[PDB]
Amino acid sequence: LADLERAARDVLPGEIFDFLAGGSGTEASLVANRTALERVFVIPRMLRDLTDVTTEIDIFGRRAALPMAVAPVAYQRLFHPEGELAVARAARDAGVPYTICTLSSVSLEEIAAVGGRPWFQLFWLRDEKRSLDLVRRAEDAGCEAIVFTVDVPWMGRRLRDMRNGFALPEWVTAANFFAPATWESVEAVRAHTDLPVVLKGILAVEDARRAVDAGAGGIVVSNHGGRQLDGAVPGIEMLGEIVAAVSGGCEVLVDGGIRSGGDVLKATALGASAVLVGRPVMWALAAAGQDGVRQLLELLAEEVRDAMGLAGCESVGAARRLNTKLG
Amino acid sequence: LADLERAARDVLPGEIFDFLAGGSGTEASLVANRTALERVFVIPRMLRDLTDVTTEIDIFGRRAALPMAVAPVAYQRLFHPEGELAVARAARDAGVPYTICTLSSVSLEEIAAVGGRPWFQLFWLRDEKRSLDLVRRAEDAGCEAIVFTVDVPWMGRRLRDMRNGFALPEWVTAANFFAPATWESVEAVRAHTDLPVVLKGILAVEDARRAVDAGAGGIVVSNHGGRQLDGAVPGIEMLGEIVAAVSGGCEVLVDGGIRSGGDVLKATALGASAVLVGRPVMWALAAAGQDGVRQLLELLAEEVRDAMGLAGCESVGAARRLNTKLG
Amino acid sequence: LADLERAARDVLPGEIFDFLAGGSGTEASLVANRTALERVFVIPRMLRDLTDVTTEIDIFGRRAALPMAVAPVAYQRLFHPEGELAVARAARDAGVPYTICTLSSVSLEEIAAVGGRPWFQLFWLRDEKRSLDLVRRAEDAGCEAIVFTVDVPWMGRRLRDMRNGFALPEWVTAANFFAPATWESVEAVRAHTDLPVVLKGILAVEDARRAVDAGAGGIVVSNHGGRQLDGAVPGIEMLGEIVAAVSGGCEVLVDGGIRSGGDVLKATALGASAVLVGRPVMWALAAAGQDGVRQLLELLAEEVRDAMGLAGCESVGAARRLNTKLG
Amino acid sequence: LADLERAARDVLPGEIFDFLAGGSGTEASLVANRTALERVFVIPRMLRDLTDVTTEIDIFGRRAALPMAVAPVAYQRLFHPEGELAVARAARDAGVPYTICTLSSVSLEEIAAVGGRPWFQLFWLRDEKRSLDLVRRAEDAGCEAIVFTVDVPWMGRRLRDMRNGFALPEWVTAANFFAPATWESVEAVRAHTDLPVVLKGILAVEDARRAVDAGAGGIVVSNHGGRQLDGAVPGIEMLGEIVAAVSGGCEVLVDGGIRSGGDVLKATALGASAVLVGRPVMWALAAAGQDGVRQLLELLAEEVRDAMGLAGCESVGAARRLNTKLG
Numbered sequence A, B, C, D: 001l002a003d004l005e006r007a008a009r010d011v012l013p014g015e016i017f018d019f020l021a022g023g024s025g026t027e028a029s030l031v032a033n034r035t036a037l038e039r040v041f042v043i044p045r046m047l048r049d050l051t052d053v054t055t056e057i058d059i060f061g062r063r064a065a066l067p068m069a070v071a072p073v074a075y076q077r078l079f080h081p082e083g084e085l086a087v088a089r090a091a092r093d094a095g096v097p098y099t100i101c102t103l104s105s106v107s108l109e110e111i112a113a114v115g116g117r118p119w120f121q122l123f124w125l126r127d128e129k130r131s132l133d134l135v136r137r138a139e140d141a142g143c144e145a146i147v148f149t150v151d152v153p154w155m156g157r158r159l160r161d162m163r164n165g166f167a168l169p170e171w172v173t174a175a176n177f178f179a180p181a182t183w184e185s186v187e188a189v190r191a192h193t194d195l196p197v198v199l200k201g202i203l204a205v206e207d208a209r210r211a212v213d214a215g216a217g218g219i220v221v222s223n224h225g226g227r228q229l230d231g232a233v234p235g236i237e238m239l240g241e242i243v244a245a246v247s248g249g250c251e252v253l254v255d256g257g258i259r260s261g262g263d264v265l266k267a268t269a270l271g272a273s274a275v276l277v278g279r280p281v282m283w284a285l286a287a288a289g290q291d292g293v294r295q296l297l298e299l300l301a302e303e304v305r306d307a308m309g310l311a312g313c314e315s316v317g318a319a320r321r322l323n324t325k326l327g
Ligand SMILES: Cc1cc2nc3c(=O)[nH]c(=O)nc-3n(C[C@H](O)[C@H](O)[C@H](O)COP(=O)(O)O)c2cc1C
Pocket: A019, A020, A021, A033, A071, A072, A073, A074, A101, A102, A103, A121, A149, A200, A222, A223, A224, A225, A227, A255, A256, A257, A258, A276, A277, A278, A279, A280
């Protein structure tokens, strides 16, 4: 919700609010994530049984309360002193998976100890052995999926951060402590874990197909929130094509700009299994810590149920069968 | 007309003007109703006989003076002290059907006693028997059609109203005194009345077809003025597809954003039998009571005749055969 | 040119500037005339012989210096005291046809006496005999074509004029001194003159075809400058379709929003034989009388030649064979 | 980069900043060059080997460091006292071809003596012999290609310059010291040089094909930065069609609005061999002379490499095989 964004702008130092809000380049891809969702209209169905509307899904072996997970966002102590623990606690209590980052400001084992349904996001290290160590650590700690970020051979050029000369406060560190990943890297991860491997940052149809062929359990259709290639298509504009191409071969998630339950409904109707949400979770953390994130997740939960029922869907499956029109 | 909107803003308390003007969510569907009409252009015909231009139609057994009816709008005493009686009187005198609401602030029997061509809008009650009682009451009072609202399994989230903490003044009540409706509910209504049943809030083509199959006498292609699902397609964007699918099997009405006789002409040219008009009627009621609504209906009548003749149509039938271009 | 518009706003009384600038309704069709031209892009050709670029055309038996004529605009004494005589003189000297109006503020015989290539615009009178008298007068005076306006069964609702309570100054009159025209009216005119009859205000393809069948020598594809049906498609959006349908059976002119030589080039490339120009001619008349109109026509002549040659066209015929892309 | 534009506005006299920034007419084609690029989105590829990303290309017999050359811009002493020598030096040092203009404010032999990879832009003179002299001079001086400008049968109408009454300062001259070029002119140039002839200002597909047939070694798909025909399509909107039509028969360059490495990537993905960059180079020259241009070229080099790798391309060839989506 947009209320939370203003609250976060008030509390955070400007340069940190910019690290959070910004995109790469001219921010064309950042803006397009929103434009893309705004142009999607749902064709709701009427007069269906709504006696037992449920927003639950099963994904990567487990039930989730909503078709949504908290996206990986590095260094969450930048936003609140409890950082990742505040968010992970709120996510647990909401029944939403939480993605622990490779660049988390609290150790992955500490965040996993919170409980809930933790996933682990991997950045490939120069050193196949350390990469595979991180994976093994995550698995030993009870993470349920490996979200391999594949869109960051190196970081995008964030002009806000360069303009600010933004740097990590010395009170924030990479508590778990890089090279471009390839398909060979994916295979090394797949061969070393029994957890589902989910490739995050896929936009081309042939890469979605190859992800299935590679043994991925999922993909996240994503332009990294407009922070990587400036001019990369929004994931929501590729999603329907990608869902058709994989034809049920893996879960297909999407992110970028999801700001309401209606947006979740749009993504579902375009064929997404679930969405990730990034910036809004951080606005809520900045504004009110754990209880802020809890309130955000409850509002999203309400909005998703509302939208589903208004659209005649008693389940997320039904929402996936909704048609859309581009406006 | 837009003159009336400003007049109403001046006279009404802010929170009531917001209950009236607002949509759900981000108001995306509210804005899109207008955008959709603005992008439609008519291809007028020339050099046709206009000696006897008539705006009359026959609908649900009766003549109407224009291809238009007053939409159901709950609690019209919110806008003027004479509420529904002022509007119903003006509608009668203009030869326009008036839709009496389930949530009317004057009793349905009182409004029907005004005369004219009253229709009755139904909200389904938890309790098939009370629902069917309302229907029987309406029929006994001389209502000519049952407008079953099928897009409100529960109310949309109106953020204006939540922000205002808007509530009914204790001087406005539901003078006729809820559960999600299904297709079984439609059948129960159809089996209990000889009046045409008109399903209001249809947007999917397959729901329009099923409405015909269900024995509806009409549908209203509608996103509830942008007040229900935020992100629901505008009815005007579905209308041509829907008209083709039903292929004369029931009357096909449309609403949402109709603000002029030219807009009526656009809807007709897209295949609508008639339109509903909501907010403008309430602006006129707020501004000048019965005579306000009369002046609005006379202006609309003038604008419809003007537009028709400019477009070479001596009858509404001819207007339906006009072609359009999207701009 | 836009310089002239400001100059005219300065000199004219507000209500007269509004009679000139305004459209009907919400001015949707007025704005769309401009939008339509702005979205058209020309694909220029290179490396062609331009040794003898000519902007001349033959139309309705006679040479014209440019593919352009002055549109019919009633009551030109509203804008300058010399009214129609100032404009007709400038047009003559530029080699541009001038359309004398039925509602001219100087008599048709006086304006024709100026010389040049006068056409005569007809409004159909209640009274076939008086209509045919006007036609005969025009023909006896040496007018070369009858421009039958077919888009005014009655006048559009000009809200600017209603708001101003605009009325003709008693010093402006209809110096030549109404009913809806039909196809029978066209035939009566065609049977009573040997001059080419040009139907002005055609937008539907089937009306363009029927115009040919009816023996018209031309049509003007036009929404009457956005002053008749509000929501009528711009002529420029129908032109290519219309040109294809008539397949050389009559001349096909266009008007609405032409504001430069580049706009003339766009219209030509879409298949127009020539354009009409209305409002700009009146801005020039208001600003500087006869010499104002002369300067406007010389600027347009320069701009047309410039655009043609830049686009590799040594003749208007070649310009008609240019391709376009919609942006 | 946009930083440089403001810096240049500060330092340059207004009328010179306008000679540089302006387009012809209403500047519709100038704006459309930017719009066109902004609507192009790239579909990046992931997980490819990026161990040796190279931005180098071979063109017209020689290696270039980037798929980019400095566009021909007349009279560069207008912007800085070192004019063309400052730019040519920076280009040399960056490994970017520099296009020497026929209307250069330093002699072509002086600029060629700088070294690097100089090309020579030709304007056709009234006098085939002088034209061919210029060509021979360029060839004798070591220029590697002849960029024949074919979109200037005469200059466009630059309203900024007419409004300013802009004229060359007497301290700027055409140091190398006109008629419309035709296909016969192209042949005369082709027959008189062994250098590749590159036709600059092609927009029609059939002109691109005829350029190949004529023995051109390249074309530049271009609307001359919006300075020639106002309303000419942007080159970027024709590029994909043109690349398909020539089917490898010559190099296909593009210009107009390229303002970042991401823009270069878009052009490549649409099929361009390379781009030209005009205005930005002049902003950098105005702001900081030779070192300004060097800094611009290093920033562009960084941005091109960044974008390529983010998009999974280890070479420009790979970038050409990227797909795009129009937004
Ligand atoms: C401050 C910030 C940090 C991020 N850090 C990471 C990261 O460490 N790993 C990752 O895969 N994605 C990262 N992302 C991208 C998000 O996972 C997600 O793709 C993007 O934020 C989704 O868009 P949304 O923020 O619009 O909801 C980050 C995003 C932001 C805004």
